Amino acid sequence: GSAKDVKFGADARALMLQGVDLLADAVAVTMGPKGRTVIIEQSWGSPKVTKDGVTVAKSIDLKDKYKNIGAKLVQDVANNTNEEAGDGTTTATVLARSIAKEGFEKISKGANPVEIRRGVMLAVDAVIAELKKQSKPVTTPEEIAQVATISANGDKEIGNIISDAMKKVGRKGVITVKDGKTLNDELEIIEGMKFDRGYISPYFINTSKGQKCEFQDAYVLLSEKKISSIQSIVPALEIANAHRKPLVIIAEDVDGEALSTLVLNRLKVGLQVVAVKAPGFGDNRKNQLKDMAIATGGAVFGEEGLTLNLEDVQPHDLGKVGKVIVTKDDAMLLKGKGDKAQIEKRIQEIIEQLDVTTSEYEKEKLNERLAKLSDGVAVLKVGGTSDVEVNEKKDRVTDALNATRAAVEEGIVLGGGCALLRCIPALDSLTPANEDQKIGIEIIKRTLKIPAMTIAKNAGVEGSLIVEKIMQSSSEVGYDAMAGDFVNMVEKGIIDPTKVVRTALLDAAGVASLLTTAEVVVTEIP
Amino acid sequence: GSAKDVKFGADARALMLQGVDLLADAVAVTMGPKGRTVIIEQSWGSPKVTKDGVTVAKSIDLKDKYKNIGAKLVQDVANNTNEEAGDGTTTATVLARSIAKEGFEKISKGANPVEIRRGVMLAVDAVIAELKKQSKPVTTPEEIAQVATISANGDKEIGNIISDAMKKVGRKGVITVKDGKTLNDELEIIEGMKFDRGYISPYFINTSKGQKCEFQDAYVLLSEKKISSIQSIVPALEIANAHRKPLVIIAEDVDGEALSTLVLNRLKVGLQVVAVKAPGFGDNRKNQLKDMAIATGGAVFGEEGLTLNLEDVQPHDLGKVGKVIVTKDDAMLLKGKGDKAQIEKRIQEIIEQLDVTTSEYEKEKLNERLAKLSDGVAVLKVGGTSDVEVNEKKDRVTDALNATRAAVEEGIVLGGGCALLRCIPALDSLTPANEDQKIGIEIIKRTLKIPAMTIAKNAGVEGSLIVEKIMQSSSEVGYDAMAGDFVNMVEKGIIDPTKVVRTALLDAAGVASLLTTAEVVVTEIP
Amino acid sequence: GSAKDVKFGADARALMLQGVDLLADAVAVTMGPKGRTVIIEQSWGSPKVTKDGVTVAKSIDLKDKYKNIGAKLVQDVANNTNEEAGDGTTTATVLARSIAKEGFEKISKGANPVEIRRGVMLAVDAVIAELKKQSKPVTTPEEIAQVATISANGDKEIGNIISDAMKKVGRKGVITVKDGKTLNDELEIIEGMKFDRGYISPYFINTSKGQKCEFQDAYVLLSEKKISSIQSIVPALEIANAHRKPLVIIAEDVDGEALSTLVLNRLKVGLQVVAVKAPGFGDNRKNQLKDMAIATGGAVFGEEGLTLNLEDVQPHDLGKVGKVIVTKDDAMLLKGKGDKAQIEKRIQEIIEQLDVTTSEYEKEKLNERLAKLSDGVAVLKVGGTSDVEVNEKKDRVTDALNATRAAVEEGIVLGGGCALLRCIPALDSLTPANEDQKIGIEIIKRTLKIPAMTIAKNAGVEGSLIVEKIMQSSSEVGYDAMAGDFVNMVEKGIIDPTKVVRTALLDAAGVASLLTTAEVVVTEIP
Ligand SMILES: Nc1ncnc2c1ncn2[C@@H]1O[C@H](COP(=O)(O)OP(=O)(O)O)[C@@H](O)[C@H]1O
Ligand SMILES: Nc1ncnc2c1ncn2[C@@H]1O[C@H](COP(=O)(O)OP(=O)(O)O)[C@@H](O)[C@H]1O
Ligand SMILES: Nc1ncnc2c1ncn2[C@@H]1O[C@H](COP(=O)(O)OP(=O)(O)O)[C@@H](O)[C@H]1O
Ligand SMILES: [Mg+2]
Ligand SMILES: [Mg+2]
Numbered sequence A, B, C: 001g002s003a004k005d006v007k008f009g010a011d012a013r014a015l016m017l018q019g020v021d022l023l024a025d026a027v028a029v030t031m032g033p034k035g036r037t038v039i040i041e042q043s044w045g046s047p048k049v050t051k052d053g054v055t056v057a058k059s060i061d062l063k064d065k066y067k068n069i070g071a072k073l074v075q076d077v078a079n080n081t082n083e084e085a086g087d088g089t090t091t092a093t094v095l096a097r098s099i100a101k102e103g104f105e106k107i108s109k110g111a112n113p114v115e116i117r118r119g120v121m122l123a124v125d126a127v128i129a130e131l132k133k134q135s136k137p138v139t140t141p142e143e144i145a146q147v148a149t150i151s152a153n154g155d156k157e158i159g160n161i162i163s164d165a166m167k168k169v170g171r172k173g174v175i176t177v178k179d180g181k182t183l184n185d186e187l188e189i190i191e192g193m194k195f196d197r198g199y200i201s202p203y204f205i206n207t208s209k210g211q212k213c214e215f216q217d218a219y220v221l222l223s224e225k226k227i228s229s230i231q232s233i234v235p236a237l238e239i240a241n242a243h244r245k246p247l248v249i250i251a252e253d254v255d256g257e258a259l260s261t262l263v264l265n266r267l268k269v270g271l272q273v274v275a276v277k278a279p280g281f282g283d284n285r286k287n288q289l290k291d292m293a294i295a296t297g298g299a300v301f302g303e304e305g306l307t308l309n310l311e312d313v314q315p316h317d318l319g320k321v322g323k324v325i326v327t328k329d330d331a332m333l334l335k336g337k338g339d340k341a342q343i344e345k346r347i348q349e350i351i352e353q354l355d356v357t358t359s360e361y362e363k364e365k366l367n368e369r370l371a372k373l374s375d376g377v378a379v380l381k382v383g384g385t386s387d388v389e390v391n392e393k394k395d396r397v398t399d400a401l402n403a404t405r406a407a408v409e410e411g412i413v414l415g416g417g418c419a420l421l422r423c424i425p426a427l428d429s430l431t432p433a434n435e436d437q438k439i440g441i442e443i444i445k446r447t448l449k450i451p452a453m454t455i456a457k458n459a460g461v462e463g464s465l466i467v468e469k470i471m472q473s474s475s476e477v478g479y480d481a482m483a484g485d486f487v488n489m490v491e492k493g494i495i496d497p498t499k500v501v502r503t504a505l506l507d508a509a510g511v512a513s514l515l516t517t518a519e520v521v522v523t524e525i526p
């Protein structure tokens, strides 16, 4: 293969550690309320600014291949943490560096870095246990706004708007975030099944106010094929006029004689029908019509395999919806009736799809957004006066959103970094099997102090004074680095979801403890 | 051809030896419980970490073409050893270096390196003989877990889970290894004939609990062609309703009027049929349907075999299975009856297939899991917090698995490196034909000491002290380098499969003794 | 054309001589039992190891274009020798260098290198004459194993296995060599029947890689008459093929409706039939089909004669073959089963026929009947623990094979190099026409000593002492360089085929004597 060059021992370790230390030093300035931003040059456009640890970490590759190895491993840590939790990234980075340094330094000739790894892993298991003991599950929706506001670097309006969206959509509902054109944030809430297709004919309109067709207690007909009929349409109308209900028809297109029947029966006798095009993109529309089928209760006509033909309809083959509103541009269906088991089955199917499907043909979320919650879906239109600002703010809101979900699903624990600090006594009551494992437990024991001391160091104060003052003080009190003084943590609102504190530590220790086991590194020649 | 440059004698030998020594020095740090890991840069991704001798060895090519020649030969050793046995690789490398150095040094004018090679090979035959004498075939299922745990670098949970899988699937059954998404290891066991295809219609469902089609004592119909027409489907249903058994139908597709008959006859007069698509990949599906055919006892219709049409079936042309379970995603058959002679014939055919074919279109293994699944198969899903960790652990698990199969199929012998040390007296009772052969036997005699001394050296202790203390000690005793003291080897569980110990030595000596014969080296100019 | 650069006289001669001397020096270390190997870098893979003079010679091109000219001419010599004889390559190289050096040195102003060439060629003719006088044709099959073992560099097992194969296949039978997977050598002997007739239709093809019909455990149908028949047999034998085996059909011709049924049943439901014309000419084909009948076990149909009729077949009336392969031009059958007693009876009939028949048209066919019957070819599956070892051993085996064939077809003469040494007195009784020719004869006279002194020099001994000791000694005695002492040559088994000794010398002198004629060299600019 490619010509290569190899390096042995603490010499090479010092290089990889140089890379780790560089990347960590770049990431760590963002940490906490008094943290600061990092500008990253973009190849094509104007530069990004970010406070996100992981986005800083991924941006830094290094010319020196060994230092680049270290860097790649640390950004591996920050990326794993961001994927598994969505916050706690800077923390995972500084933790990873601390474990890597304290690891590397303690190795000698007699030492056994694999066994030391075993010891640190023991120590982190023991720590996350005590973390779970410390966890108190979220209750009041004030705590939601607190977790959000703290994860958004002190922006109260962010955690307010997130609290509102999460209230109006539900704690495990769908919230998504995108750019506003407005200079301020907006919360929009959509309920139903909305998609961007409008009535084929103006003649379908019911209300002269808004120019909408508005229906309630309506039927739905779903056709995967065109309806140029053939009059495969008529039984579907006879069946509708029979039970005196309005009928909405969704199809690849509805035209030829079909449309003529539709707008003749609409304009003369006062029949209640609308026809709209399928959401429409090839193989995607098939999946969408199957979604609306499953949600509204009923079945899709045309070719899947077993073909259900339009001539032979039954009322149980249609669909049933609480309300429907259609305009020139878009169609919304509301309160559709079907098996809730079958719909949640469907959502469980699409999430497990998108999760494996590294495709970035992300309309699968547009599907997931469509097959609607419980209580609905929320769009977060972020404002600001400039694109770079918008990207910063949106990074922070995405962080706060992921943080709130982690909080509701696992728990909340003390902020500052105190949650990791309080776990040290749990390490003090450990029973190491040998010197190596003891070294590991010592490494974790030192490493736990780091996040709090770093948040304080960014404040411009003597962080390691503050860590020890916190340790001498009671369990409920910690350091408010923004206000610059000690306070009750949970009372003052400074709190972190337990899931992020767990995942940051687990990932960081997980990769760094493996890094410390290295004795020889092999790299490509420039 | 290409312009070239040539070198003569001990100078070139010293260069090639420099290459050998470099690569060997890189691989050898991994050896034993106190061994250490090697990081290797990947071109596209984050770097690999490994304790695997072969993956270290293959990763190192060298700029100096002569040193690269040495390196390539050593990679030949490690790769041959990994292919033929799957462990014992680091050992094969250090052995190969020892034979190469001790070989090169002993060369002079009057000397005859070919004959020295002959003496070395004599010595290797003589040692592996005594190794086979030392071998004690495995008995208790504690010993498998011991061999696994030692081959997995001291991870007891690995050898436990391997012991469990090997118990529940059998000692020569199929175990396979893959990534978990879970942070922990999992053992899953599949029984039957599973494949990833589901019922064509929901209407086939019978149990409503899980939403499965569940059958017992069922028939199987196998069609390699599509089944649209009624005419070729109906008699197969008449014969099924006749003998009052459920019928599962596997086909390229079930589609036209056939399907309509199927779910109509399903929904009324409660007939018990299910239909599923063929596992489905062109020429692969043919082989799969033939597998399921012979396994369930019976024949495939639509084949280029053949002379058999779907209209003329007989109950002896179908299939017979103890139980069947089908879902939206997958289909499982469990206790199908057919000639065990004929199915083991089939498995004997596929192993002899895959063994010849180097094309990594590993569906041939996907076949092997399926038709061997009527004993069972185990998937070992390895956990961890990060991909690099997962690749390391999985490397170790694959090592331990190959080691356990080598142990059950050939035998077990003393671990540490003692098994080779104990064979030295067998060399002492040899009768060399001439000085050259005597030099060879001396080379092997020195070389046997190496693996134990290296495992001790990695521990941070005086390895060659330990070798002599072991040699002075009794046959049953060796050095526990992890515990850092001497012990009964077999009692303490430190044992190596004989197959890896024979194959490492045989390969290493095999190429290195050839390397020592060189007098002139010819290389391309840069 | 391309810009060029030219050089004049003994300067350019000295450069070309530098190239010759380099390549020769690289090749010459391989010579004899105490010779040594040459490693050659491969561009794509792991390096080659070899003892083959020609493969060393072809591997060496040179940057200096003049030296490269010399090198190209010497590898021309080694390649010509390898093509024409298959051994004796290093010998041809050292001979060529000796003639080139001794040639170049003797050139002056008054000298006429063309005439010197004439003298050299005279000397070589005179030498090969006396060589042919010395040749004693091989008799005992011990001599075969001797020639093989010596040409295989002392591997007794090689010459044993070659002796066995040559006994069991015949001295002018087919032996071929290929890689084993076994760690040991294997002799396999296959028996077959090739003849020059191909499938009647392309539609019969069953491989797509190449254009063959390939079958294994097949049946054979033998018809002395044409098969143009309807379903009055073709199905009745096909119906016999119930218990599914592939079918080969050999007939005077197969056409009309028969063929249509054949390629209909072939093209629709993939039935396994092939049909080929009888080997075919008049009364000869009758005897041939009876031969194939007796060999494959079974009977000829259509024999009128009277008469087994084609309508009345039984499976015991067909034929049974381990394998059958072929394409458009020829037909090959492999491992046919029948009574070996009846086959040896048949061969005993053909020889006793052949011995007495008038006059010499029939015996040309009677030979072909014999050599198409009574067949085998030997496959030499070479073992070893690694690909490079296998390639080395295979080089040596192919060398020994070509050497044995040269020995059986031309003769054997003294080994060591003594066969050339004994020819010197024949040069002593020459009558040169002028000084130039005398220079040539002197050049050959010196050159003959070279191979023996070189084999001794590789041993580490004073080669030119040994040459003169041999010359002082009797004709039957020479130097055993492996045993390190003088012995009777033929008695100890050290012997070389006369053909290789002839061809090495003839080629070497042929090219080198032309090289010595050069006065101006013209080469491309870098
Ligand atoms: N006012 C504050 N006083 C003390 N600690 C704070 C305050 N605000 C935020 N923090 C701490 O800062 C940390 C969050 O830092 P952040 O920049 O979000 O890093 P990450 O992106 O890794 O989560 C939390 O652990 C939180 O406890
Ligand atoms: N606790 C232990 N004490 C002493 N020797 C050990 C111990 N564990 C493993 N060994 C020995 O060390 C060797 C491990 O080799 P390993 O590092 O797995 O590389 P490979 O198996 O690829 O050569 C085995 O031969 C084994 O006998
Ligand atoms: N034991 C031996 N004693 C003397 N000469 C030997 C012996 N074995 C082989 N030779 C000689 O070595 C010569 C060269 O053989 P080899 O090394 O295979 O190269 P080549 O390709 O020229 O045959 C042969 O002429 C043969 O007679
Ligand atoms: Mg944050
Ligand atoms: Mg191992």
Ligand SMILES: [Mg+2]
Pocket (backbone or CB within 6 Å): C087, C088, C089, C151, C152, C399
């Ligand atoms: Mg030879």
